[PDB]
Each structure stands twice: as structure tokens, then as C-alpha cells.
Design a protein around this motif. Structure first.
Motif, PDB file in Angstrom:
ATOM      1  N   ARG B  11       0.836  -1.352  -0.045  1.00 17.20           N
ATOM      2  CA  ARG B  11       0.087   0.031   0.070  1.00 17.20           C
ATOM      3  C   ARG B  11       0.975   1.053   0.013  1.00 17.20           C
ATOM      4  NH1 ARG B  11      -3.137   1.766   4.702  1.00 17.20           N
ATOM      5  NH2 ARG B  11      -4.831   2.966   4.051  1.00 17.20           N
ATOM      6  N   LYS B  13       1.221   5.702  -0.147  1.00 15.95           N
ATOM      7  CA  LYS B  13       0.606   6.742   0.031  1.00 15.95           C
ATOM      8  C   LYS B  13       1.409   8.118  -0.644  1.00 15.95           C
ATOM      9  CE  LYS B  13      -0.514   8.438   4.283  1.00 15.95           C
ATOM     10  NZ  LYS B  13      -1.426   8.649   5.543  1.00 15.95           N
ATOM     11  N   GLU B  19      -1.834  17.234  -1.942  1.00 11.32           N
ATOM     12  CA  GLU B  19      -2.862  15.947  -2.359  1.00 11.32           C
ATOM     13  C   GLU B  19      -2.105  14.637  -2.209  1.00 11.32           C
ATOM     14  OE1 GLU B  19      -5.179  16.515  -5.839  1.00 11.32           O
ATOM     15  OE2 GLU B  19      -5.044  14.633  -6.341  1.00 11.32           O
ATOM     16  N   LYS B  20      -2.967  13.789  -1.437  1.00 11.59           N
ATOM     17  CA  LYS B  20      -2.416  12.542  -1.188  1.00 11.59           C
ATOM     18  C   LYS B  20      -3.300  11.663  -1.889  1.00 11.59           C
ATOM     19  CE  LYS B  20      -0.062  13.820   2.951  1.00 11.59           C
ATOM     20  NZ  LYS B  20      -0.471  14.828   3.461  1.00 11.59           N
ATOM     21  N   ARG B  21      -2.659  10.422  -2.189  1.00  6.27           N
ATOM     22  CA  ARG B  21      -3.269   9.502  -3.137  1.00  6.27           C
ATOM     23  C   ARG B  21      -2.838   8.157  -2.783  1.00  6.27           C
ATOM     24  NH1 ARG B  21      -4.726  10.133  -8.772  1.00  6.27           N
ATOM     25  NH2 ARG B  21      -4.232  12.569  -8.925  1.00  6.27           N
ATOM     26  N   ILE B  22      -3.762   6.991  -2.352  1.00  7.96           N
ATOM     27  CA  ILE B  22      -3.424   5.539  -1.956  1.00  7.96           C
ATOM     28  C   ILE B  22      -3.516   4.810  -3.185  1.00  7.96           C
ATOM     29  CG2 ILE B  22      -3.471   3.805  -0.500  1.00  7.96           C
ATOM     30  CD1 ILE B  22      -4.271   6.007   1.655  1.00  7.96           C
ATOM     31  N   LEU B  23      -2.505   3.855  -3.442  1.00  3.05           N
ATOM     32  CA  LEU B  23      -2.816   2.936  -4.464  1.00  3.05           C
ATOM     33  C   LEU B  23      -1.866   1.664  -4.114  1.00  3.05           C
ATOM     34  CD1 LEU B  23      -1.448   4.881  -7.674  1.00  3.05           C
ATOM     35  CD2 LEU B  23      -3.660   3.870  -7.368  1.00  3.05           C
ATOM     36  N   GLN B  24      -2.436   0.421  -4.503  1.00  2.00           N
ATOM     37  CA  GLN B  24      -1.952  -0.819  -3.914  1.00  2.00           C
ATOM     38  C   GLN B  24      -0.952  -1.272  -5.169  1.00  2.00           C
ATOM     39  OE1 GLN B  24      -5.375  -2.675  -1.997  1.00  2.00           O
ATOM     40  NE2 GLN B  24      -5.857  -1.898  -4.113  1.00  2.00           N
ATOM     41  N   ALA B  41      -0.787   9.725 -11.971  1.00  2.00           N
ATOM     42  CA  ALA B  41      -1.613  10.213 -10.764  1.00  2.00           C
ATOM     43  C   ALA B  41      -1.655  11.930 -10.965  1.00  2.00           C
ATOM     44  CB  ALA B  41      -0.993   9.849  -9.651  1.00  2.00           C
ATOM     45  N   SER B  80       0.745   2.075   5.449  1.00  2.00           N
ATOM     46  CA  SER B  80       1.164   2.458   3.987  1.00  2.00           C
ATOM     47  C   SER B  80       2.746   2.884   3.972  1.00  2.00           C
ATOM     48  CB  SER B  80       0.403   3.483   3.609  1.00  2.00           C
ATOM     49  OG  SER B  80       0.473   4.760   4.039  1.00  2.00           O
ATOM     50  N   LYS B  82       5.004   5.657   2.574  1.00  2.00           N
ATOM     51  CA  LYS B  82       4.686   7.324   2.389  1.00  2.00           C
ATOM     52  C   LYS B  82       5.785   7.823   1.385  1.00  2.00           C
TER      53      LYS B  82
END
Lengths: 102, 88
Positions: B11, B13, B19-24, B41, B80, B82
Motif C-alpha cells: 500500500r 501513499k 494532495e495525497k493518493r493511495i494505490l496498491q 496520478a 502504508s 509514504k
């Protein structure tokens, strides 16, 4: 013979769409939920804005922006894991809260 | 058995300009995977920096990232990886 059956993601999904200075709409989602479909519902409930994205709060308390289906899947996966922890302890389950974003 | 042997996804972040985005990310994770998803992104090629609380360090080689994933995998308090993104 015995085998493991499916472990469901989770028990109905409620997305709480929080609207600035206006209230919140609790959308009970019928069971794939698509990013497009979330934007469509936001556009119905918040009709005089244009919404390209939304935010949720992660486990660190940070606002995370979602702009894609892959991002949706990461949001949902985290949510489901939190709900499963709480379900097992009889803690109150809260809906998945999102914040529309220009 | 002819089904996939899934390991845990990583995971991530990302952060860029507030701006923050989470992707696996599927394992093994590569720097170029992170770079290319960060481009999708945020629209630009990014420099990648690992962050933990007050610490920031550039991630420039596959080995650097491998070190950061190891830290994440042994860290019961972090859920996550970071990554701070800077244009270039």
C-alpha cells in the motif's frame, strides 16, 4: 469433505457523502462499484457544483483524494479491513464517509 | 494447484503539493512502477522520496526502495509506504 468457503469483503455498504454546510446523504450501495458511479451520485446530491473527485480519511487521519478506479479499490479494501476488525469486536460500524472535491 | 500464489500488495501513499493518493502495488515493487503510477496520478515525471514522520530520504535505486518496503513490512504501526513526490 470440508473446505473453506468464500470470506465476503464484508454487512451492506453505506457511503456517507458529506456535503459542505448542507448535511450528508447516506447512500446504501447494492452489490463492482465504479468511480464513475460514485461521481454520478455526487452529481445528483450536489447538483450545482461540478465534482471531479472526492476525498476520504485514512488510518493516519489524512485526507486522501480518489481520481480513479484503482484508487477506489484501495479505499474500499482499507474500509473493508476496518469493518471486519470492528465486526469481530461488536464495535459500531460506521459508513464510509466521502467529501466531494472540485 | 494452478491458481496464483498472491503475496500481500504494498500500500503506497503518495503526496504531491498537498494532495495525497493511495494505490496498491503488486510485489515485487519496482521504482519505475512507482514513478509511472505517480506520472499517471499527477501528470508529470517525479523524483521520489521516502518519508517517515520527520525523516525524508530520496529513493534513487531499486535497493533504496527495497529497504523502504522492508521497513514497512516489519512496522506493525504503519499501514502504508509514504512517498513524497517532487517534480523532476
Amino acid at each position: 469433505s470440508m473446505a473453506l468457503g468464500p470470506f465476503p469483503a464484508m454487512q451492506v455498504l453505506v457511503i456517507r457523502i458529506k456535503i459542505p454546510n448542507s448535511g450528508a446523504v447516506d447512500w446504501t450501495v447494492h452489490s463492482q462499484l465504479l468511480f464513475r458511479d460514485v461521481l454520478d451520485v455526487i452529481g445528483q446530491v450536489l447538483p450545482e457544483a461540478t465534482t471531479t473527485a472526492f476525498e476520504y480519511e485514512d488510518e493516519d487521519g489524512d485526507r486522501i483524494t480518489v481520481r480513479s478506479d484503482e484508487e477506489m479499490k484501495a479505499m474500499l479494501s482499507y474500509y473493508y479491513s476496518t469493518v471486519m476488525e470492528q465486526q469481530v469486536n461488536g464495535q459500531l460500524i460506521e459508513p464510509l464517509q466521502i467529501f466531494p472535491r472540485a | 494447484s494452478s491458481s496464483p500464489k498472491k503475496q500481500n500488495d504494498v500500500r503506497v501513499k503518495f503526496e504531491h503539493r498537498g494532495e495525497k493518493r493511495i494505490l496498491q502495488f503488486p510485489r515485487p515493487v519496482k521504482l519505475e512502477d512507482l514513478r509511472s503510477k505517480a506520472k499517471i496520478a499527477f501528470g508529470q515525471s517525479m523524483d521520489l522520496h521516502y518519508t517517515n514522520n520527520e525523516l525524508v530520504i530520496p529513493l534513487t535505486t531499486q535497493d533504496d526502495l527495497d529497504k523502504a518496503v522492508e521497513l514497512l513490512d516489519r512496522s506493525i504501526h504503519m499501514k502504508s509506504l509514504k512517498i513524497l513526490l517532487v517534480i523532476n
